[PDB]
Amino acid sequence: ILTDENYVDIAEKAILKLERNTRNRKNPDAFFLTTSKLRNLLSLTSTLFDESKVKEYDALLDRIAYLRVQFVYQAGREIAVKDLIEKAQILEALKEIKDRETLQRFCRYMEALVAYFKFYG
Amino acid sequence: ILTDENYVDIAEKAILKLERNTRNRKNPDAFFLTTSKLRNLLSLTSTLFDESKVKEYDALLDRIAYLRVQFVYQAGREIAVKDLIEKAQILEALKEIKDRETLQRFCRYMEALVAYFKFYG
Amino acid sequence: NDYRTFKLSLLTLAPIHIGNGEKYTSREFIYENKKFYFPDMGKFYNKMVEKRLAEKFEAFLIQTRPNARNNRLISFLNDNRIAERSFGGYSISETGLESNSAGAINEVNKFIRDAFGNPYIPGSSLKGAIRTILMNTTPKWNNENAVNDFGRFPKENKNLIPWGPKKGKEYDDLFNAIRVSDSKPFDNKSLILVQKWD
Amino acid sequence: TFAKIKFSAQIRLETGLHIGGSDAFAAIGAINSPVIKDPITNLPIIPGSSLKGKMRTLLAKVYNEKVAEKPSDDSDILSRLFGNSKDKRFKMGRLIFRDAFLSNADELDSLGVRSYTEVKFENTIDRITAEANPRQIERAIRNSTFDFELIYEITDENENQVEEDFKVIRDGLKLLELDYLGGSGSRGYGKVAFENLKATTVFGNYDVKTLNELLTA
Amino acid sequence: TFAKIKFSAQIRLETGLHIGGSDAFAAIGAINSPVIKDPITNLPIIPGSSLKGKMRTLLAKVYNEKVAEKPSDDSDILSRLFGNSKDKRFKMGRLIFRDAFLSNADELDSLGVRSYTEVKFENTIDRITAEANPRQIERAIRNSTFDFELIYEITDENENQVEEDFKVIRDGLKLLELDYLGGSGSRGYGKVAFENLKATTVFGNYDVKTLNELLT
RNA sequence: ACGGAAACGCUUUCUAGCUCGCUAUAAUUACCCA
């Protein structure tokens, strides 16, 4: 669960609790996660935030049901995302939606992840 | 922190303590910070300053939450917005807003930063 | 009426891909016949959560077996005997090239399409194409572009072509004056999915 | 006397338009140039302010003898149709531009439309270093159509200027079709057609028989 | 004889209302033309002054025999219904406009609506130089409804003038439906629609069932 | 047998007129990895 009063701090604590380069100490503390792959994660939600604004949840429930699968498939390919869908409770908090204002809050959580990822790195 | 006292006198003091082009001696002493990057944050606080005059504070919790995301994200993109939100303690003043009279104090504080940004150069 | 108009006819010698930023993954197409079938995957997961196969699909997606023939979502359909392929989306027929363990292409980029699903070429694309031609063939715009040297020679000046409102001055803005429209949308029989070759 | 007659039309978009819009609380990845929409149905709008604003400045290349440099320097054919502030007689002038609303939203479900706007990626390419600068700007979709009312006052001050003004109205509507009505415009984004140009009296008694023969002709 | 009858109707709107309040020096990025809003509920009003002034100036174009310099020079058909400061017979003239107070906050919240007022973003383009200068103006949103009510008094022998006053008042409501009520006006911002036009007599004895048919 | 009694600070009056959310801008570039 992520609520409207905690999700940004959850997102900061998830981006910090995330692995880094142990070796290659020339410019250290660089993540084993790249900006392109995390923007690939946010691309899945950017075309649902607009329709969370526009139209009803009973046409977006199908697209959230496939959003679970999109996060599963991105978790399976690279191990960098695989240790981000667990740190950030993404698959846990994706089952927690059930309306519009939690879909919007989840998309804002993804943006908070991207924001703290740009801010650290 | 900023109280209903010097919160505007903080903002002016943040702008004069903000880095400039020591280089570019063709209209010199100008900031690295471009005013469009700062009006894109005043746009957020301006819509919140307008809605705080009407709606409640519980009906602004998600909206206010997203403020921190943008002040993080805009800081992670340009280094100029980064020392804007560091010299002006914006991420710290964002954690302090808990009432509508404190939300409006932050929302007028950002207007003071924009006012003194235009007033100097 | 100073609006002198021009009509540009554009023939394609080479294949032209434009647009959209989206890409189908390696598990979001179907190659049954000589026709790559790109379905609406939301309806594809709707139809297949009803057949108890959603957990089996979640198992399929993290399943990196060898012989990429068995990793391209035809294998998920013919494996668990799914013959109803009635989903929204579109087919584009095969080139016959890019083969055999065929059909094992991986990520296609979708061409730019309007809301009806009919593809088109936007005029912002072709206007930028015109703009490089007009910049390069001008010994006023070649000279002093790469400027400021601060970050890492970072950017064009963007003012060798004078642009803006420009307070006090009259409004010139050369490239506001050239106005390229979009195209009437062609049909998606015209798309083929070439690969890339360095 | 007093009469009010009503120009109806149906605005059909082509490469549909982007009348730029509201929200600051948008996203980090999604639509960052939003379009203006109805606050209640979330359908796109053509506001009457942008219609009047393009129509003045396209009629003002044509109907000003001396160059404008300001409104209230227009040439008493546009001051009476669009108002000045600084003529005593031309302040409320004779034309009301209502906001156009999306009409064929049920027709645009028989065609395969997921949403009544579209998002279009647009990408400033840098010409040295070749670095890209993407953006997602929203626009209404192509075959969108709009109700268009435009109301005209005919007092006794419209002594014999009704026909002369309707020349100007149907000149401005055909001049918007040669230009773009808001948005990028030089990059597509504009092209508007006006069908079913039909003028009817809504108040008073006036003849609309001879009015609908410089409209449809 | 004496009676007070009440015209209640519902001001729906389309191309919603800007009707300005304070043009006080606003905030730096905020609304430049705030709409007039109630002090307690912070919802829009369509006040009685705007309805009364619009309906004089639109009925002054219709029912004046001669063009008036001022409301003092209006015809007696309008001077008796809207008052006249200068005619002794027509001071306190027969109609009471009341402020209108947003009937459907609950129906609009039942719809997908965040705020009852929108802020539309707008600009002017200079003609030489083509500079742009923006605007954020507030606008009571589109399908809001507002409780409109008039009170008409029926005194000593105004009784011969009752019917052909309501033909006027109806007509005035037909001219607000063709004009705009309030700010910015010729750029949208205006379209109202009076619905459920019902005349009820409140004090005294008048037969409004021979009259409520006139307003359908 | 109250410096008192009697007396609506009231009538009339549109926050309104003018104003394009606009200007520039190819969803692109590099070619590899186990």
User: Closest Cα to residue E9, out of E212, E206, E196?
Assistant: E196
Phi-psi category of E129—alpha, beta or left, where left has phi over 0 and alpha has psi -120 to 50? Answer: left
Query: E132-140 and E3-13: which strand pairing?
Result: unpaired
Provide the angle, in degrees to the nearest 10, between the axes of the packed helices B35-52 and B79-87: 50
Q: Which amino acid is at D204?
A: G
C-alpha of B23 from chain center = 26
Q: In what order do the strands lie in the sheet with C30-31?
A: C30-31, C35-39, C89-93
Residues 6+ apart with CB under 8 A from D162: D152, D154, D206
User: Closest Cα to residue D140, out of D54, D40, D34, D50?
Assistant: D34
Phi-psi category of D123—alpha, beta or left, where left has phi over 0 and alpha has psi -120 to 50? Answer: left
* Entry resolution (Å): 3.0
Q: Are A60 and A40 in contact (CB under 8 A)?
A: no
Residues of A in CB contact (< 8 Å) with C are 43, 62-63, 65-66, 69, 72-73, 75-76
Domain of residue B95, residue span: 1-121
Contacts of B51 in chain E (CB under 8 A): 115
DSSP 8-state assignment for residue C123: H
Q: Are E27 and E35 in contact (CB under 8 A)?
A: no
For A44, C100, C116, D145, E121, the CA distances from D116, given in Å and listed in that order, are: 20, 44, 10, 11, 21
Q: Looking up tokens 């020339």, which residue turns up?
A: A26
Distance CA D116, CA D146 (A): 13
Domain of residue D61, residue span: 1-217
Contacts of A51 in chain D (CB under 8 A): 115
Distance CA C148, CA E7 (A): 71
Distance CA B71, CA B75 (A): 6
b/e string for D89-115 if b means 16 or more Cβ within 10 A? ebeebbbbbbbbbbbbeeebeeeebeb
The CB density around residue D215, as the number of other CB atoms within 10 Å, is 19
Q: Which amino acid is at E9?
A: A
- 3-state SS assignment for residue A72: helix
Contacts of C64 in chain A (CB under 8 A): 76
Distance CA C195, CA B96 (A): 54
CB contact under 8 A, B73 and D28: yes
Of D48, D96, D155, the CB nearest to E61: D155
Instruction: Dig out the tokens for D164 from the structure.
Output: 């002369």
Residues 6+ apart with CB under 8 A from C16: C121
Distance CA E215, CA E200 (A): 11
Residues 6+ apart with CB under 8 A from A5: B61, B65
Q: Looking up tokens 């948005």, which residue turns up?
A: D183
CB contact under 8 A, A62 and C49: no
Query: D192-203 and D3-13: which strand pairing?
Result: antiparallel
Chain D: give the shortest CA distance to residue E112, in Å: 6
Find the closest chain C residue to D174 by CA distance.
C1
Instruction: Dig out the tokens for D72 from the structure.
Output: 């209230």
Distance CA C154, CA C136 (A): 19
Q: How many domains does chain B have?
A: 1
Chain E: give the shortest CA distance to residue D78, in Å: 14
**Dihedral (CA of C113, C114, C120, C125) sign:** negative
Alpha helices in chain E (DSSP H): 48-63, 76-82, 105-110, 163-176
Instruction: Dig out the tokens for D146 from the structure.
Output: 């709009």
Chain D: give the shortest CA distance to residue E61, in Å: 7
Q: DSSP for D44-75, please give it.
A: BEE-HHHHHHHHHHHHTTTS-SS--SSTTSS-
Q: How many domains does chain E have?
A: 1
Q: Which amino acid is at E114?
A: R
Q: Are E181 and E50 in contact (CB under 8 A)?
A: yes
Tell whether D27 is within 8 A of chain A (Cβ).
Answer: yes
For C92, C197, D56, D112, D113, the CA distances from C85, given in Å and listed in that order, are: 15, 33, 55, 19, 21
Output the CA angle C57-C61-C66, nearest 5 degrees: 120
Q: Are E150 and E159 in contact (CB under 8 A)?
A: no
Instruction: Dig out the tokens for E35 from the structure.
Output: 């709409």
* End-to-end Cα spacing for chain E: 27
Q: In what order do the strands lie in the sheet with E3-13?
A: E95-97, E147-154, E3-13, E192-204
User: Closest Cα to residue D21, out of D33, D38, D13?
Assistant: D33
Q: Are D64 and D78 in contact (CB under 8 A)?
A: yes
DSSP 8-state assignment for residue D184: S
Distance CA D180, CA E138 (A): 26
Distance B76 CA to F13 C1' (A): 57
Residues 6+ apart with CB under 8 A from D21: D33, D34, D35, D36, D37, D138, E121
Distance CA A59, CA A77 (A): 29
Within 7 Å of a protein beta carbon, the nucleotides of strand F are 8, 10-32
Residues 6+ apart with CB under 8 A from D66: D73, D75
- Nucleotide with the nearest C1' to D51 CA: F20
Chain D residues 121-180 with a CB less than 8 Å from chain C: 121-122, 125-129, 131, 134, 141-142, 178-180
What are D117's strand-pairing partners? D140
Distance CA E152, CA E154 (A): 7
Q: Which of C169, C171, C175 to mutate to test the interface with E (most CBs of E within 10 A)?
A: C171
Distance CA B73, CA C27 (A): 32
Q: Are E86 and E76 in contact (CB under 8 A)?
A: no
Q: DSSP for B48-116, please give it.
A: HHHHHTTS-SGGGHHHHHHHHHHHHHHHHH-HHHHHHHHHTTHHHHHHT--SHHHHHHHHHHHHHHHHH
Q: Are C121 and C18 in contact (CB under 8 A)?
A: yes
CB contact under 8 A, C49 and A65: yes
Q: Is E110 exposed, middle or buried, given 0-12, 13-18 or 19+ CB atoms closer than 10 A?
A: exposed
b/e string for E143-169 if b means 16 or more Cβ within 10 A? bbbbbbebebbbeeebeebbeebbebb
Q: Are E131 and E156 in contact (CB under 8 A)?
A: no
Alpha helices in C146-193 (DSSP H): 174-177
